[PDB]
Design a protein around this ligand. Structure first.
Ligand SMILES: Nc1nc2c(ncn2[C@@H]2O[C@@H]3COP(=O)(O)O[C@H]4[C@@H](O)[C@H](n5cnc6c(=O)[nH]c(N)nc65)O[C@@H]4COP(=O)(O)O[C@H]3[C@H]2O)c(=O)[nH]1
Ligand SMILES: Nc1nc2c(ncn2[C@@H]2O[C@@H]3COP(=O)(O)O[C@H]4[C@@H](O)[C@H](n5cnc6c(=O)[nH]c(N)nc65)O[C@@H]4COP(=O)(O)O[C@H]3[C@H]2O)c(=O)[nH]1
Ligand SMILES: Nc1nc2c(ncn2[C@@H]2O[C@@H]3COP(=O)(O)O[C@H]4[C@@H](O)[C@H](n5cnc6c(=O)[nH]c(N)nc65)O[C@@H]4COP(=O)(O)O[C@H]3[C@H]2O)c(=O)[nH]1
Ligand SMILES: Nc1nc2c(ncn2[C@@H]2O[C@@H]3COP(=O)(O)O[C@H]4[C@@H](O)[C@H](n5cnc6c(=O)[nH]c(N)nc65)O[C@@H]4COP(=O)(O)O[C@H]3[C@H]2O)c(=O)[nH]1
Ligand SMILES: [Mg+2]
Ligand SMILES: [Mg+2]
Lengths: 406, 405
């Protein structure tokens, strides 16, 4: 009976705390290791890694290939980066949790730097959020910090990882807390709007892109702080419908003479009620329909082409038009332009970031010709310096947008 | 050390085999009890209960109400059934697994009858039960359990779907069914029947299309595999094939009357299918007037936004649509006013299984609503003149079934 109990104990232990796919700790293992680390010392850092490319693999090539990639990333992650008291677990379907005790901020960065380099050799599309615990924090607090840091990494892909320290003065909220605050901001009309003009070299204004923000108790919140929570909760269409209503009100006032570019989140386009909503509202404001440009992220066209085409049809049937926002980020998978024929393409802002890389300049010219050959206006994005402005000039970009154009 | 070892083992067992929401065994616990029961005896029955209304609750009222309903049904299940060695587990998000050892068929049926009446007290579900009469593996029983559940859904007049383990019917897993359908599509193994829906004076309103296929002498009807196609998000592939084959028949200028094509619910919630129907109809505008798309009532009440996009695309191209299983959700029947379907095909539960009086009033009311809105009412699956005369007493316009054609 000894052999029964001893081996039954290990199988029960692995059933309770081990995820069969990744062969790492499961979510319950992670919370146990997290709660014990906090109650004893709480000195160290915590990190979360999301493998969105594994999510894209699951429906594309089935789950046999998806499970194999989870195991591969798990095997590659765990055999590398071995330190004392290191907890590595699979806390959800597409994200991994990591606990690094007895490490200060600089030590976590080298571990986080080693994580990312550990995922470049193994598939060649991920996001890494890391937080350092420098105050006494509860377990829900660190998970909220971990989630907001992950949103920071996604919203700024030029960062290798998103870093937030537990002592930060920044407002950190959970997903449902962000949604409640946005609903509060929508209800009380706390929103403010900015209009950035996209101008040609001749001063002709193509359109003015609308940026949404809101303020509560003297604190200002921008869209990249809460948009991850709304899309994860399938509530971003509430936010987009409010912005579209407010923008159309301004056009109905006969004030703005030029077209306005409204950003649309991906989670809103995959909502069929939002696709019906656009047709119903655009038909009630046909006079201003020609002055509305809907800015659709490139991720929509390549990941949700059918939802996007339904949205694009509704937009154009009502006398409006649309463009692409992160144009060029998904290079070698950018043939959707030929099918969709957008009115414009707004370049990925990472093109103004790495001018010196010769391979970056080759991709930039190639996607520039493709749009113009089809008669599609190209727009450079987030241009800050005359150096960026002059370097983008060699790629025959028609109109420019950013702080240097004012 | 003895009491300590028992606590460590019990807590380890609790983390491994307890579902925190339902406070029942989880899936791993159920597979363990099933694999042990099979390897020990294998005598008895096995059952699956799917609470589709709980899936409606999670999006409707959040997860706090969804967790509470799972616990309520879980407490209801364990306290009501009072027999030995009964495993009650939550094997998936919205379905419960039950093992009933040492029971013959009549005992399984009274236990299955006790389950459903146990869920009528507190609150839309399906119960599938199989009796083990063979030496069967675990995957076999799960496949039988899934096909029995599909039998219960495709025949809602049954309280539960019953399959014997020794049945001659072809029992396949979800991916196996999907493989067989794709094989039939590739080789054009499909056959079609056209059943006419006629008015009281013989005018044919349309002809509904029924799809089936044969593989080396075995015939398969749609209700055997459609459940596996709607799961795995693959039913639109089958519907597109049927639509393609029907349009080829209409192009030949033979059929003077419209054809009613059934569309699965999982196909309309696929946006690629909504795009496909517009492109296909735009290439065959001449025959679009001869196309009626029969949409299940569950689409209009559970997936109204997808259905509105599909209905608009269908009518924009010169086709039309109607409602299938009309009256099954009598308590949510204002979609008719918004959608204005060309016809409503009554739930076949109104022709058969309809002498309890409360159901006879619902038939009259939903018939008035359709006629007042100028919508054609069609009785379904009419077999006898007795039914035919009785449906006329509810002023039904046109009739369909074996007795008319
Ligand atoms: N029965 C049931 N209870 C639920 C469910 N969702 C949340 N609860 C609870 O709601 C609290 C707030 O969750 P959140 O708004 O999504 O805000 C979350 C979320 O922003 C983040 N977070 C937690 N887990 C994860 C994760 O696995 N991945 C990512 N990226 N963020 C997470 O930390 C914050 C708080 O985490 P929690 O401590 O777990 O605190 C959560 C959780 O205890 C559910 O689906 N079913
Ligand atoms: N270093 C530098 N930065 C510049 C420059 N020009 C603009 N930025 C800012 O970069 C973002 C450009 O908008 P986005 O890339 O489409 O990315 C947007 C956009 O995806 C989203 N967003 C903003 N407003 C909305 C909205 O109203 N609706 C939706 N669905 N998303 C919005 O949040 C993101 C951030 O918007 P903002 O915080 O206001 O930040 C804006 C803009 O203020 C520049 O020249 N140099
Ligand atoms: N690693 C991995 N493997 C997967 C996954 N999905 C399916 N499989 C594998 O493929 C086999 C076929 O499952 P199925 O085709 O959907 O066909 C299923 C299905 O028709 C039926 N059925 C099975 N489980 C359930 C269930 O939990 N609920 C309901 N309603 N029906 C079930 O039993 C058949 C499968 O028996 P299984 O022993 O479970 O054997 C499964 C399982 O080993 C997955 O997501 N990840
Ligand atoms: N006792 C009796 N039975 C009758 C009578 N008339 C028809 N039945 C049959 O009942 C079903 C009526 O079709 P349904 O209610 O829409 O229910 C259909 C329908 O929902 C689906 N189905 C059949 N063909 C197709 C198809 O081509 N595409 C899709 N998406 N579903 C189909 O499978 C289900 C079963 O169709 P079938 O097995 O061929 O069985 C058909 C029909 O042959 C009658 O007078 N008396
Ligand atoms: Mg933009
Ligand atoms: Mg039908």
């Amino acid at each position: 009976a000894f052999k029964a109990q001893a081996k039954e104990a290990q199988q029960l232990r692995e059933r309770a705390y081990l995820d069969p796919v990744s062969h790492l700790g499961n979510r319950a293992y992670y919370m146990s290791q997290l709660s014990g680390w906090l109650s004893e010392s709480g000195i160290g850092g915590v990190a979360i890694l999301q493998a969105e490319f594994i999510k894209e693999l699951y429906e594309e090539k089935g789950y046999e290939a998806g499970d194999g990639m989870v195991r591969e990333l798990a095997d590659r992650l765990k055999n590398s980066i071995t330190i004392k008291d290191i907890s590595i677990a699979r806390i959800s379907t597409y994200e991994f949790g990591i606990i690094m005790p007895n490490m200060d901020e600089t030590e976590l960065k080298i571990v986080a730097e080693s994580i990312i380099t550990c995922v470049d050799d193994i598939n060649p599309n991920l996001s890494l959020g890391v937080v350092s615990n420098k105050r006494q924090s509860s377990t829900t607090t660190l998970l909220s910090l971990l989630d907001n840091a992950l949103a920071k990494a996604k919203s700024n892909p030029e960062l290798n990882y998103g870093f937030i320290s537990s002592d930060t003065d920044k407002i950190i909220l959970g997903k449902q807390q962000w949604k409640t605050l946005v609903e509060e901001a929508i209800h009380n009309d706390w929103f403010t709007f900015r209009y950035q003009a996209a101008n040609s070299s001749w001063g002709k204004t193509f359109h003015r892109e609308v940026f949404s923000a809101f303020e509560k108790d003297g604190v200002r919140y921008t869209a990249n702080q809460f948009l991850f929570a709304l899309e994860q909760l399938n509530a971003s269409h509430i936010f987009d419908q409010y912005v579209i209503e407010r923008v159309i009100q301004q056009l109905e006032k006969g004030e703005l003479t030029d077209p306005l570019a409204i950003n649309i989140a991906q989670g809103s386009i995959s909502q069929p009620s939002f696709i019906r909503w656009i047709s119903q509202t655009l038909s009630k404001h046909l006079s201003v329909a020609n002055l509305l440009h809907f800015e659709i992220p490139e991720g929509c066209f390549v990941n949700e082409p059918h939802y996007t085409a339904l949205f694009c049809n509704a937009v154009r049937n009502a006398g409006a038009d649309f463009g692409v926002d992160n144009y060029g980020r998904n290079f070698q998978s950018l043939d959707y332009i030929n099918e969709f024929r957008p009115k414009y393409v707004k370049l990925d802002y990472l093109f103004t970031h790495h001018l010196d890389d010769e391979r970056q300049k080759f991709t930039l010219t190639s996607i520039s010709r493709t749009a113009h050959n089809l008669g599609i206006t190209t727009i450079a994005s987030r241009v800050e310096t005359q150096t960026q402005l002059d370097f983008l000039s060699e790629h025959f970009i028609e109109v420019f947008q950013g702080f240097i154009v004012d």
